[PDB]
């Protein structure tokens, strides 16, 4: 009962992964609300529940399948289904907790984690910073297996949390930033897994602030700069939407145009 997109790591290519992320972006928003050439995701206020989520069914060479659910108002993974079980991050407010009761209503076993999907907490559970968790088509293959065998009781929590970290960056963050999408394309192109460097980490960390900066900007000029980092960790300051046009693909709704 929500729109579904399929992606398989089996035989995946730069093109198959790019096609996947481009499909994800187009399901997340129509692109009708654009500010300074960057699409805005739908405002959660007044959004019908039947339009609130999209699904991404992931499959791997082992022929295991899991179905991620993404909230269209923020592009993030809110939970997933494996077989006859569904799992959801702990939402931040009661209203989102009501929203997710509409996901995977057919499954017999439904669980809410005692933790939300924020990186600080996922990293603690995983026992590693994102800096130490390789991304790529191999990591995604393994994360699909981990998520699926979490539903049999096999996969334990650190490996699951690490697998969420992989999925969230390769799907949700790749959707929000064409820069991160490009980072994953390079890993797939050269068939090489590697962890994200600070240029990726600080984009992921600043998506909400960047969204606010842009939407509240004066003709594109940020009221205050936003600090990022280059690949070597050195400071990079953003003053203007202009440099973000090739970087960020989607913003969360923060105000009306």
């Amino acid at each position, epitope marked *: 009962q929500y729109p579904i997109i399929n992606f398989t790591t089996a035989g995946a290519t730069v093109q198959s992964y790019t096609n996947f992320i481009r499909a994800v972006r187009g399901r997340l928003t129509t692109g009708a609300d654009v500010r300074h050439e960057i699409p805005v995701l739908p405002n959660r206020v007044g959004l019908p529940i039947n339009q609130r989520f999209i699904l991404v069914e992931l499959s791997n060479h082992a022929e295991l399948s899991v179905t991620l659910a993404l*909230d269209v108002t923020n592009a993030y993974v*809110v939970g997933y289904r494996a077989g006859n079980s569904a799992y959801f991050f*702990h939402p931040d407010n009661q209203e989102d907790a009501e929203a997710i009761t509409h996901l995977f209503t057919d499954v017999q076993n439904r669980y809410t984690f005692a933790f939300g999907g*924020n990186y600080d907490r996922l990293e603690q559970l995983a026992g590693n910073l994102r800096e130490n968790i390789e991304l790529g088509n191999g990591p995604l293959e393994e994360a699909i297996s981990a998520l699926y065998y979490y539903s049999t009781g096999g996969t334990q929590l650190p490996t699951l949390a690490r697998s969420f970290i992989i999925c969230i960056q390769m799907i949700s963050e790749a959707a929000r930033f064409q820069y991160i999408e490009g980072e994953m394309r390079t890993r797939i192109r050269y068939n090489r897994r590697s962890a994200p460097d600070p240029s990726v980490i600080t984009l992921e960390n600043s998506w909400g602030r960047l969204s606010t900066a842009i939407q509240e900007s004066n003709q594109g000029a940020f009221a205050s700069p936003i600090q990022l980092q280059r690949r070597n960790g050195s*400071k990079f300051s953003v003053y203007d939407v202009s440099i973000l046009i090739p970087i960020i693909a989607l913003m969360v709704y923060r105000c009306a145009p």
Partner: nanobody
Amino acid sequence: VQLAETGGGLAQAGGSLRLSCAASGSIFSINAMGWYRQAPGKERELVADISGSGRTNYADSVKGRFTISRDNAKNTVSLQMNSLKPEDTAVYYCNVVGGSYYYDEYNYWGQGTQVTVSS
């Protein structure tokens, strides 16, 4: 979310100060905490921050001099400022970001503490 800043104040060049910030409230998906600083006619700059998982960043000019630490049980961060320079004079602001569905769904600032270092 409420932020309580303490510490700071006046110091001599080469002296030491310590800042601390304790968060409370709707805090379950809290992420990075840190300190920005702003001098009277200058741009705000990140001084240091720290994630609940222990990642620490520092402005280049404070490395080897300032150290940040965090206690997740109390949602508190401290900034130990050694070998203070006149250039460290500024209003220092604690910042907390969090969110279950993205890193910085909320972004709260402290009131600001003055730090003044004589040359």
